[PDB]
Design a protein around this ligand. Structure first.
Ligand SMILES: [Ca+2]
Ligand SMILES: [Ca+2]
Ligand SMILES: [Ca+2]
Ligand SMILES: [Ca+2]
Ligand SMILES: [Zn+2]
Length: 316
């Protein structure tokens, strides 16, 4: 809506205090006018009609328990916006400062979050398996990144292309987490998963097999569940991504790590310039190798490390 830009303050899902950009027009709305064509956060009010109502607040103070998921969806959308702009020179998910809209309090006890083709959706979790999923910055950036992929490579959400789609989202989800530099790791969802259990997460990039996900192609899932295993076989690519950045020996293959930033540049370039809707794992290897060549030279350590990594996960 039309109004004046101001700055609110509140607490997120983890009890942390943060400022948020809002818009005043009788009420203070969760509308951030400082990023592109705006960031907009809505209340689905425990129902599943979307997007719901633009979040309105009377005093610009968001310290109510009900406010927390909105605070974080709004804030971490902004962090994710900042990451794509400052690091990859990318203006929102479509590259042309599309408005980023989020809805929270989706359904009742909804243990998930997603991008629905046009916006972000966040459940509150049932309080046992999950707390409000917008509490996880990797979760927020994971889903926003599906918006980026859909507008770029267009990787079809199934089988290998689908598993690449998922890995890409786990990759930048993680890089945005490190970018915010708050308890960063190579795990996914740990901030909001199983509040009653420490140390766990939905997935691990550094060791997929800790949750039963493959870390080698020869261990790939070929059934038809989970759209052919997109959240399973993603472990093979996540593992490769982890290796390129952090290095290691995996099934006897040594990888020289090149760090997060170079991982980020190679996979972004791959994502936006070489991958296509039907790309398979072998094709991703080729795209990554070419991105690193483009970026660092065919004789670079970088290109070599990319090859090592895909080698280690059995992807030729
Ligand atoms: Ca208030
Ligand atoms: Ca973390
Ligand atoms: Ca994480
Ligand atoms: Ca937990
Ligand atoms: Zn996903």
């Amino acid at each position: 809506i039309t109004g004046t830009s101001t700055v609110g303050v509140g607490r997120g899902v983890l009890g942390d205090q943060k400022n948020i950009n809002t818009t005043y027009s009788t009420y203070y709305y969760l509308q951030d006018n400082t990023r592109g064509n705006g960031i907009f956060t809505y209340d689905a009010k425990y129902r599943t009609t979307l997007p719901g109502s633009l979040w309105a607040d009377a005093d610009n103070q968001f310290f109510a328990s009900y406010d927390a998921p909105a605070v974080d969806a709004h804030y971490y959308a902004g962090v994710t916006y900042d990451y794509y702009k400052n690091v990859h020179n990318r203006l929102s998910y479509d590259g042309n400062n599309a408005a980023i809209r989020s809805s929270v309090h989706y359904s009742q006890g909804y243990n998930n979050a997603f991008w629905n083709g046009s916006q972000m959706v966040y459940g509150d979790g049932d309080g046992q398996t999950f707390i409000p999923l917008s509490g996880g910055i990797d979760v927020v950036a994971h889903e926003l990144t599906h918006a980026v992929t859909d507008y770029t490579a267009g990787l079809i959400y199934q089988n290998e292309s689908g598993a690449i789609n998922e890995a890409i989202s786990d990759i930048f989800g993680t890089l945005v987490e490190f970018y915010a530099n708050k308890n960063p790791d190579w795990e996914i969802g740990e901030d909001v998963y199983t509040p009653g259990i420490s140390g766990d997460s939905l997935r691990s990039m550094s060791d997929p097999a800790k949750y039963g996900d493959p870390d080698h192609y020869s261990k790939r899932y070929t059934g038809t569940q989970d759209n052919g295993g997109v959240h399973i076989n993603s472990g093979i690519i996540n593992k490769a991504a982890y290796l390129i950045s952090q290095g290691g020996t995996h099934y006897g293959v040594s990888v020289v790590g090149i760090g997060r930033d170079k991982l980020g540049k190679i996979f972004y370039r791959a994502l936006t310039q070489y991958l296509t809707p039907t790309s398979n794992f072998s094709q991703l290897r080729a795209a990554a190798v070419q991105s690193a060549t483009d970026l660092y030279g065919s004789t670079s350590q970088e290109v070599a490390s990319v090859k090592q990594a895909f080698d280690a996960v059995g992807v030729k």
